[PDB]
Amino acid sequence: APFVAPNVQGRVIKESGYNTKTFKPAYVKPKHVIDPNMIIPRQPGEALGTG
Amino acid sequence: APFVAPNVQGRVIKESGYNTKTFKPAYVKPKHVIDPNMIIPRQPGEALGTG
């Protein structure tokens, strides 16, 4: 607090305000194409020979 | 105490004097002026739009 000789008025004290933060979320979009070149070939569980 | 041959009168011992201290307090005067400029603006808790 300010020391102020009691013979005088007093001292005016300043203030401070405040702030805000604002954010937009980002966007994510992966995809696969699944044409036959991927469906046909033998997958690991398939028996050798026939499948 | 002084060793004094029992014949003679004995020695005169002295004393010492005290001391003092004195204090005045200081004086403190914070004050604020409250404009409409400070009452009106939105305060953080208030909702958006219709504060």
CSV table of N, CA and C in Angstrom, one decimal:
chain,number,residue,atom,x,y,z
A,1,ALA,N,0.8,-1.2,0.0
A,1,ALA,CA,0.0,0.0,0.0
A,1,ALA,C,0.9,1.2,0.0
A,2,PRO,N,0.4,2.4,-0.5
A,2,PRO,CA,1.2,3.6,-0.6
A,2,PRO,C,1.2,4.3,0.8
A,3,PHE,N,2.4,4.7,1.2
A,3,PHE,CA,2.4,5.6,2.3
A,3,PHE,C,2.1,7.0,1.9
A,4,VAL,N,1.2,7.6,2.6
A,4,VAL,CA,0.6,8.9,2.3
A,4,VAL,C,0.5,9.8,3.5
A,5,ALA,N,1.1,10.9,3.5
A,5,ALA,CA,1.0,11.8,4.6
A,5,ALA,C,-0.5,12.1,4.9
A,6,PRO,N,-0.9,11.9,6.1
A,6,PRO,CA,-2.4,12.0,6.4
A,6,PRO,C,-2.9,13.4,6.1
A,7,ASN,N,-2.1,14.4,5.8
A,7,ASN,CA,-2.6,15.7,5.5
A,7,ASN,C,-3.1,15.8,4.0
A,8,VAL,N,-3.0,14.8,3.2
A,8,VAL,CA,-3.3,14.9,1.8
A,8,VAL,C,-4.3,13.7,1.4
A,9,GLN,N,-4.8,13.8,0.2
A,9,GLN,CA,-6.0,13.1,-0.1
A,9,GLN,C,-5.9,11.6,0.0
A,10,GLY,N,-4.9,11.1,-0.6
A,10,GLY,CA,-4.8,9.6,-0.9
A,10,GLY,C,-4.4,9.4,-2.3
A,11,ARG,N,-4.0,8.2,-2.6
A,11,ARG,CA,-3.4,7.9,-3.9
A,11,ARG,C,-4.3,6.9,-4.7
A,12,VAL,N,-4.5,7.2,-6.0
A,12,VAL,CA,-5.4,6.4,-6.8
A,12,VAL,C,-4.6,5.2,-7.4
A,13,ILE,N,-5.2,4.0,-7.2
A,13,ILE,CA,-4.5,2.8,-7.5
A,13,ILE,C,-5.1,2.2,-8.8
A,14,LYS,N,-4.2,1.8,-9.7
A,14,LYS,CA,-4.7,1.3,-11.0
A,14,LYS,C,-5.0,-0.2,-11.0
A,15,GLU,N,-5.7,-0.7,-12.0
A,15,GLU,CA,-6.2,-2.1,-12.1
A,15,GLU,C,-5.7,-2.7,-13.4
A,16,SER,N,-5.9,-4.0,-13.6
A,16,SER,CA,-5.6,-4.6,-14.8
A,16,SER,C,-6.8,-5.5,-15.2
A,17,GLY,N,-6.9,-5.8,-16.5
A,17,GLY,CA,-8.0,-6.5,-17.1
A,17,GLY,C,-7.7,-8.0,-17.2
A,18,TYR,N,-8.2,-8.6,-18.3
A,18,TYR,CA,-8.0,-10.1,-18.5
A,18,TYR,C,-8.0,-10.4,-19.9
A,19,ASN,N,-7.7,-11.7,-20.2
A,19,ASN,CA,-7.5,-12.1,-21.6
A,19,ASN,C,-8.4,-13.4,-21.9
A,20,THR,N,-8.4,-13.7,-23.2
A,20,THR,CA,-9.1,-14.9,-23.6
A,20,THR,C,-8.3,-15.7,-24.6
A,21,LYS,N,-8.5,-17.0,-24.7
A,21,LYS,CA,-7.9,-17.9,-25.6
A,21,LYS,C,-9.0,-18.6,-26.4
A,22,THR,N,-8.8,-18.7,-27.7
A,22,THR,CA,-9.8,-19.4,-28.6
A,22,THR,C,-9.1,-20.3,-29.6
A,23,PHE,N,-9.7,-21.4,-29.8
A,23,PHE,CA,-9.1,-22.5,-30.6
A,23,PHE,C,-10.1,-23.2,-31.5
A,24,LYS,N,-9.7,-23.5,-32.7
A,24,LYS,CA,-10.5,-24.3,-33.7
A,24,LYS,C,-9.9,-25.7,-33.7
A,25,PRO,N,-10.7,-26.8,-33.6
A,25,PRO,CA,-10.1,-28.1,-33.8
A,25,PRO,C,-9.7,-28.4,-35.2
A,26,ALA,N,-8.7,-29.3,-35.3
A,26,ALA,CA,-8.2,-29.7,-36.6
A,26,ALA,C,-9.0,-30.9,-37.2
A,27,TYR,N,-8.7,-31.2,-38.4
A,27,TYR,CA,-9.6,-32.2,-39.1
A,27,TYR,C,-8.7,-33.3,-39.8
A,28,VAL,N,-9.2,-34.5,-39.7
A,28,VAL,CA,-8.4,-35.7,-40.1
A,28,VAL,C,-9.2,-36.6,-40.9
A,29,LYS,N,-8.7,-37.0,-42.1
A,29,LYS,CA,-9.6,-37.8,-43.1
A,29,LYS,C,-8.7,-38.8,-43.8
A,30,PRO,N,-8.4,-39.9,-43.3
A,30,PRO,CA,-7.8,-41.0,-44.0
A,30,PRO,C,-8.8,-41.9,-44.7
A,31,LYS,N,-8.4,-42.5,-45.8
A,31,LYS,CA,-9.2,-43.6,-46.4
A,31,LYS,C,-8.4,-44.5,-47.2
A,32,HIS,N,-9.0,-45.7,-47.5
A,32,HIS,CA,-8.4,-46.7,-48.4
A,32,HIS,C,-9.2,-47.0,-49.5
A,33,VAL,N,-8.6,-47.3,-50.7
A,33,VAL,CA,-9.3,-48.0,-51.8
A,33,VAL,C,-9.0,-49.5,-51.6
A,34,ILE,N,-10.0,-50.3,-52.0
A,34,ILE,CA,-10.0,-51.7,-51.6
A,34,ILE,C,-10.3,-52.6,-52.9
A,35,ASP,N,-9.8,-52.1,-54.0
A,35,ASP,CA,-10.0,-52.8,-55.3
A,35,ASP,C,-9.5,-54.2,-55.3
A,36,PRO,N,-9.9,-55.0,-56.3
A,36,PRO,CA,-9.5,-56.5,-56.3
A,36,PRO,C,-8.0,-56.7,-56.1
A,37,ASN,N,-7.1,-55.9,-56.6
A,37,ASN,CA,-5.7,-56.2,-56.5
A,37,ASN,C,-5.3,-56.4,-55.0
A,38,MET,N,-6.2,-56.0,-54.1
A,38,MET,CA,-5.9,-56.2,-52.7
A,38,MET,C,-6.8,-57.3,-52.1
A,39,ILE,N,-8.0,-57.6,-52.6
A,39,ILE,CA,-8.9,-58.6,-52.1
A,39,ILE,C,-8.4,-60.0,-52.5
A,40,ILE,N,-8.0,-60.1,-53.7
A,40,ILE,CA,-7.8,-61.5,-54.3
A,40,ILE,C,-6.6,-62.2,-53.6
A,41,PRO,N,-5.4,-61.6,-53.6
A,41,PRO,CA,-4.2,-62.4,-53.2
A,41,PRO,C,-4.4,-63.1,-51.9
A,42,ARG,N,-3.7,-64.2,-51.8
A,42,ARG,CA,-3.9,-65.1,-50.6
A,42,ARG,C,-3.4,-64.3,-49.3
A,43,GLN,N,-4.3,-64.4,-48.3
A,43,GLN,CA,-3.9,-63.8,-47.0
A,43,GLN,C,-3.3,-64.9,-46.1
A,44,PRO,N,-2.6,-64.4,-45.0
A,44,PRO,CA,-1.8,-65.4,-44.3
A,44,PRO,C,-2.5,-66.6,-43.8
A,45,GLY,N,-3.7,-66.5,-43.3
A,45,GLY,CA,-4.4,-67.6,-42.7
A,45,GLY,C,-4.7,-68.7,-43.8
A,46,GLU,N,-4.7,-68.3,-45.0
A,46,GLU,CA,-5.1,-69.3,-46.1
A,46,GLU,C,-4.1,-70.4,-46.2
A,47,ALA,N,-4.6,-71.6,-46.4
A,47,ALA,CA,-3.7,-72.8,-46.6
A,47,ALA,C,-3.0,-72.6,-47.9
A,48,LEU,N,-1.8,-73.1,-48.0
A,48,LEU,CA,-1.0,-73.1,-49.2
A,48,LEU,C,-1.7,-74.2,-50.1
A,49,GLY,N,-1.4,-74.0,-51.4
A,49,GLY,CA,-2.1,-74.8,-52.4
A,49,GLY,C,-3.4,-74.3,-52.8
A,50,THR,N,-4.5,-74.8,-52.2
A,50,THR,CA,-5.8,-74.3,-52.6
A,50,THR,C,-6.1,-73.0,-51.9
A,51,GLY,N,-6.1,-72.9,-50.6
A,51,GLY,CA,-6.6,-71.7,-49.9
A,51,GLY,C,-7.9,-72.0,-49.3
B,1,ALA,N,33.7,-9.1,43.8
B,1,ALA,CA,33.8,-8.1,44.9
B,1,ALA,C,35.3,-7.9,45.2
B,2,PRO,N,35.7,-6.7,45.7
B,2,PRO,CA,37.1,-6.4,45.9
B,2,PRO,C,37.6,-7.1,47.2
B,3,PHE,N,38.8,-7.6,47.1
B,3,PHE,CA,39.5,-8.0,48.3
B,3,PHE,C,40.1,-6.8,49.0
B,4,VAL,N,39.8,-6.7,50.2
B,4,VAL,CA,40.1,-5.5,51.0
B,4,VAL,C,40.7,-6.0,52.3
B,5,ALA,N,41.9,-5.5,52.7
B,5,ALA,CA,42.4,-5.9,54.0
B,5,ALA,C,41.4,-5.5,55.0
B,6,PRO,N,41.2,-6.3,56.0
B,6,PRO,CA,40.1,-6.0,57.0
B,6,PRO,C,40.3,-4.7,57.8
B,7,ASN,N,41.6,-4.2,57.7
B,7,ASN,CA,41.8,-2.9,58.4
B,7,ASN,C,41.0,-1.8,57.8
B,8,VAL,N,41.0,-1.7,56.5
B,8,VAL,CA,40.7,-0.4,55.8
B,8,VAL,C,39.2,-0.4,55.4
B,9,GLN,N,38.8,0.7,54.9
B,9,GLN,CA,37.4,1.1,54.9
B,9,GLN,C,36.6,0.3,53.8
B,10,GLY,N,37.2,0.0,52.7
B,10,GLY,CA,36.4,-0.6,51.6
B,10,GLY,C,36.2,0.3,50.5
B,11,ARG,N,36.0,-0.3,49.3
B,11,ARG,CA,35.9,0.5,48.1
B,11,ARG,C,34.5,0.8,47.7
B,12,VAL,N,34.3,2.0,47.0
B,12,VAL,CA,33.0,2.5,46.6
B,12,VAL,C,32.7,2.0,45.2
B,13,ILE,N,31.7,1.2,45.0
B,13,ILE,CA,31.3,0.6,43.7
B,13,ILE,C,30.3,1.6,43.0
B,14,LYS,N,30.3,1.5,41.7
B,14,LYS,CA,29.5,2.4,40.9
B,14,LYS,C,28.3,1.7,40.3
B,15,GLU,N,27.5,2.5,39.5
B,15,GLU,CA,26.4,2.0,38.9
B,15,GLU,C,26.3,2.5,37.5
B,16,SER,N,25.3,2.1,36.7
B,16,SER,CA,25.1,2.6,35.3
B,16,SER,C,23.7,3.0,35.1
B,17,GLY,N,23.5,3.9,34.1
B,17,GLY,CA,22.2,4.4,33.8
B,17,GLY,C,21.5,3.8,32.6
B,18,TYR,N,20.2,3.9,32.5
B,18,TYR,CA,19.4,3.3,31.5
B,18,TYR,C,19.4,4.2,30.2
B,19,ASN,N,18.5,3.8,29.3
B,19,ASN,CA,18.4,4.4,28.0
B,19,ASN,C,17.0,4.3,27.5
B,20,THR,N,16.6,5.0,26.5
B,20,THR,CA,15.2,5.0,26.0
B,20,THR,C,15.2,5.1,24.5
B,21,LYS,N,14.0,4.8,23.9
B,21,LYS,CA,13.8,4.8,22.5
B,21,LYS,C,12.3,5.2,22.2
B,22,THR,N,12.1,5.8,21.0
B,22,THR,CA,10.8,6.5,20.7
B,22,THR,C,10.5,6.4,19.3
B,23,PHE,N,9.3,6.0,18.9
B,23,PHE,CA,8.9,5.8,17.5
B,23,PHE,C,7.5,6.4,17.2
B,24,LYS,N,7.4,7.0,16.0
B,24,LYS,CA,6.1,7.4,15.4
B,24,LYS,C,5.7,6.5,14.3
B,25,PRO,N,4.5,6.1,14.1
B,25,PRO,CA,4.1,5.2,13.0
B,25,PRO,C,3.9,6.0,11.7
B,26,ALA,N,3.9,5.3,10.6
B,26,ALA,CA,3.6,5.8,9.3
B,26,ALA,C,2.1,5.8,9.0
B,27,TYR,N,1.7,6.4,7.8
B,27,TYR,CA,0.3,6.5,7.5
B,27,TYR,C,0.1,6.1,6.0
B,28,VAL,N,-1.0,5.4,5.8
B,28,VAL,CA,-1.2,4.6,4.5
B,28,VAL,C,-2.6,4.9,4.0
B,29,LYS,N,-2.7,5.3,2.8
B,29,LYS,CA,-4.0,5.8,2.2
B,29,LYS,C,-4.1,5.3,0.7
B,30,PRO,N,-4.6,4.0,0.5
B,30,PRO,CA,-5.0,3.6,-0.8
B,30,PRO,C,-6.4,4.0,-1.1
B,31,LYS,N,-6.7,4.5,-2.3
B,31,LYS,CA,-8.1,4.8,-2.7
B,31,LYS,C,-8.2,4.5,-4.2
B,32,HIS,N,-9.5,4.1,-4.5
B,32,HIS,CA,-9.9,3.9,-5.9
B,32,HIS,C,-11.0,4.8,-6.3
B,33,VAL,N,-11.0,5.2,-7.6
B,33,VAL,CA,-12.2,5.9,-8.2
B,33,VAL,C,-12.9,5.0,-9.1
B,34,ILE,N,-14.2,4.9,-9.0
B,34,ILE,CA,-14.9,3.9,-9.7
B,34,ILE,C,-15.8,4.5,-10.8
B,35,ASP,N,-15.3,4.6,-12.0
B,35,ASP,CA,-16.0,5.2,-13.1
B,35,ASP,C,-17.1,4.3,-13.5
B,36,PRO,N,-18.1,4.7,-14.3
B,36,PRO,CA,-18.8,3.8,-15.2
B,36,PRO,C,-17.9,3.0,-16.1
B,37,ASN,N,-16.8,3.6,-16.5
B,37,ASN,CA,-15.9,2.8,-17.4
B,37,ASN,C,-15.4,1.5,-16.8
B,38,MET,N,-15.4,1.4,-15.5
B,38,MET,CA,-15.0,0.2,-14.8
B,38,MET,C,-16.1,-0.7,-14.3
B,39,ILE,N,-17.3,-0.2,-14.2
B,39,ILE,CA,-18.4,-1.0,-13.8
B,39,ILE,C,-19.0,-1.8,-15.0
B,40,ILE,N,-18.9,-1.2,-16.2
B,40,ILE,CA,-19.8,-1.6,-17.3
B,40,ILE,C,-19.1,-2.8,-18.0
B,41,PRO,N,-17.8,-2.8,-18.4
B,41,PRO,CA,-17.3,-3.8,-19.2
B,41,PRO,C,-17.6,-5.2,-18.6
B,42,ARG,N,-17.6,-6.2,-19.5
B,42,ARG,CA,-17.9,-7.6,-19.1
B,42,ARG,C,-16.9,-8.1,-18.2
B,43,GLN,N,-17.3,-8.8,-17.2
B,43,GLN,CA,-16.4,-9.5,-16.3
B,43,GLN,C,-16.4,-11.0,-16.7
B,44,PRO,N,-15.3,-11.7,-16.4
B,44,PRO,CA,-15.0,-12.9,-17.1
B,44,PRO,C,-16.1,-14.0,-17.0
B,45,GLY,N,-16.8,-14.1,-15.9
B,45,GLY,CA,-17.8,-15.1,-15.7
B,45,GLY,C,-19.0,-15.0,-16.7
B,46,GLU,N,-19.2,-13.8,-17.2
B,46,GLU,CA,-20.4,-13.6,-18.0
B,46,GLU,C,-20.4,-14.4,-19.3
B,47,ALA,N,-21.6,-14.9,-19.6
B,47,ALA,CA,-21.8,-15.6,-20.9
B,47,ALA,C,-21.6,-14.6,-22.1
B,48,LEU,N,-21.5,-15.3,-23.2
B,48,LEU,CA,-21.3,-14.5,-24.5
B,48,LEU,C,-22.6,-14.0,-25.0
B,49,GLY,N,-22.6,-13.0,-25.8
B,49,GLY,CA,-23.8,-12.3,-26.2
B,49,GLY,C,-24.4,-11.6,-25.1
B,50,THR,N,-25.6,-12.1,-24.6
B,50,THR,CA,-26.3,-11.5,-23.4
B,50,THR,C,-25.5,-11.8,-22.1
B,51,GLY,N,-24.5,-10.9,-21.8
B,51,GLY,CA,-23.8,-11.0,-20.6
B,51,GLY,C,-24.8,-11.1,-19.4
